[PDB]
């Protein structure tokens, strides 16, 4: 059972083309400010793949740092994303883009980030006592006034029924207080925390929001397959739903031709679970391997909207076609359903929050009810 960072080292060094890209993707980052520092501006930018591997190995036993406590004014788009911070500028280079599109690279990244996920759901923090996972969160600043208020404010911004305290909003273990970071046993439990009962009431409407999320795109009359790589990223159902690799989804692609795609963004300080947008019977469910740090040329150096200081933020439509993601298709033409045909739900990973966890209530053949929790993003691959 080899260290997945060591497997990645060997992949890079035992393949001449990946060896070349692993240098060039750093050489192509400008030396001049602001790129001498990573996008948080708090540390020097990494300039070679060996320091990158060293840091990746170190991160396997670290939780993300809440660096806004002692530095409230630096860019905050990569809160929660220590791997993303290291490769953000490389992601924006031509060689970096080619590197992070490579399937072998992304298998290695998957295994690295899944190994990280093991630590993030470990309540001992890899053998540092029964309260280690909790203490690591406190050490990382997550119980500071600044972090807690940011989480409280972010939850309140979407509702008129506002709460004063974190414990009135989110479920956490017994005797949780701010000082003990609500007795969350590990990062994963804090990350996938649930709302308290009644804090997110299920509306009467036929479709409700699946995620606590910020609207991004609403496209009508979408195509079977499209040039999703051109400026504006027209949606390509065939690629997004994985008909490239699963002939079973092709009929649903055809059934969505002419339909509409709505896309919304989940911030790091937002609720990360998934709720059923409609009532119906699950007729298709998949997971799709893909990229983690692939962003558009437009989001890179010299690009018309680049370099993204928090890639793939400005490439969200693009990555729906290539990133690690999942597909759920619900039939609402059933008893108790709203009779609006087939509804698709496509959670799409971004960077090291790319673990798509379908709950067992979403197995094909089962019926989900509007508002039920049906899955969650996790930090991981």
């Amino acid at each position: 059972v080899e260290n997945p960072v060591e497997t990645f080292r060997k992949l890079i060094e035992n393949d001449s083309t990946l060896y070349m890209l692993a240098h060039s993707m750093f050489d192509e980052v400008p030396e001049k400010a602001p790129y001498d520092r990573d996008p948080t501006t708090l540390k020097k930018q990494v300039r070679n793949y060996k320091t990158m591997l060293y840091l990746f190995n170190t991160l396997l036993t670290e939780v993300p740092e809440y660096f806004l406590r002692d530095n409230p004014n630096v860019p905050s788009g990569l809160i929660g994303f220590p791997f993303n911070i290291i490769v953000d500028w490389p992601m924006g280079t031509p060689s970096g883009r080619q590197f992070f599109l490579d399937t072998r690279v992304n298998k290695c990244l998957k295994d690295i980030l899944n190994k990280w996920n093991e630590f993030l759901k470990d309540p001992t923090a890899q053998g540092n006592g029964n309260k280690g996972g909790n203490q690591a969160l406190i050490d990382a600043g997550w119980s500071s006034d600044a972090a807690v208020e940011q989480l409280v404010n972010k939850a309140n911004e979407s509702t008129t029924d506002k709460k004063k305290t974190f414990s009135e909003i989110f479920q956490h273990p017994a005797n949780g207080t701010q000082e003990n970071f609500f007795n969350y046993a590990c990062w994963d439990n804090f990350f996938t925390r649930r709302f308290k009962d009644g804090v997110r009431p299920v509306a009467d409407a036929a479709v409700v929001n699946a995620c606590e999320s910020f609207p991004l795109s609403f496209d009508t009359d979408v195509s079977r397959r499209n040039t999703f790589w051109l400026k504006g990223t027209p949606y390509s159902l065939h690629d997004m739903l994985g008909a490239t690799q699963d002939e079973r989804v092709a009929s649903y692609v055809d059934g969505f031709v002419g339909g509409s795609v709505y896309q919304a963004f989940l911030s790091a300080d937002s609720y990360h679970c998934w709720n059923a947008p409609v009532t119906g019977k699950v007729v298709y469910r998949s997971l799709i391997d893909g990229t983690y740090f692939a962003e558009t040329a437009a989001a890179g150096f010299g690009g018309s909207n680049g370099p993204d200081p928090a890639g793939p933020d400005v490439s969200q439509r693009y990555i729906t076609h290539i990133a690690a993601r999942g597909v759920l298709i619900v039939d609402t033409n059933v008893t108790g359903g709203a009779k609006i045909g087939l509804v698709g739900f496509v959670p799409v990973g971004m960077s090291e929050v790319s673990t798509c966890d379908w709950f067992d209530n979403t197995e094909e053949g089962k019926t989900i009810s509007k508002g039920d929790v049906i899955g969650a993003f996790h930090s991981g691959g």
């Binding site: 999320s213 609207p215 609403f218």
Partner: protein
């Protein structure tokens, strides 16, 4: 993280999406999970 919801052509004729979702440039906050996204009109 991000996610998509996908609706069929004949269903979209029957639905009224809330403005914050259909016209994303107007949105200034998260939408609340479980809250209304679209309602039937016929």
């Amino acid at each position: 993280x991000t996610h998509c919801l996908i609706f069929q052509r004949d269903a979209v004729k029957k639905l009224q999406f809330i403005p914050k979702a259909q016209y994303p440039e107007i949105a200034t906050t998260n939408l609340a999970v479980n809250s209304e996204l679209a309602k039937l009109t016929s």
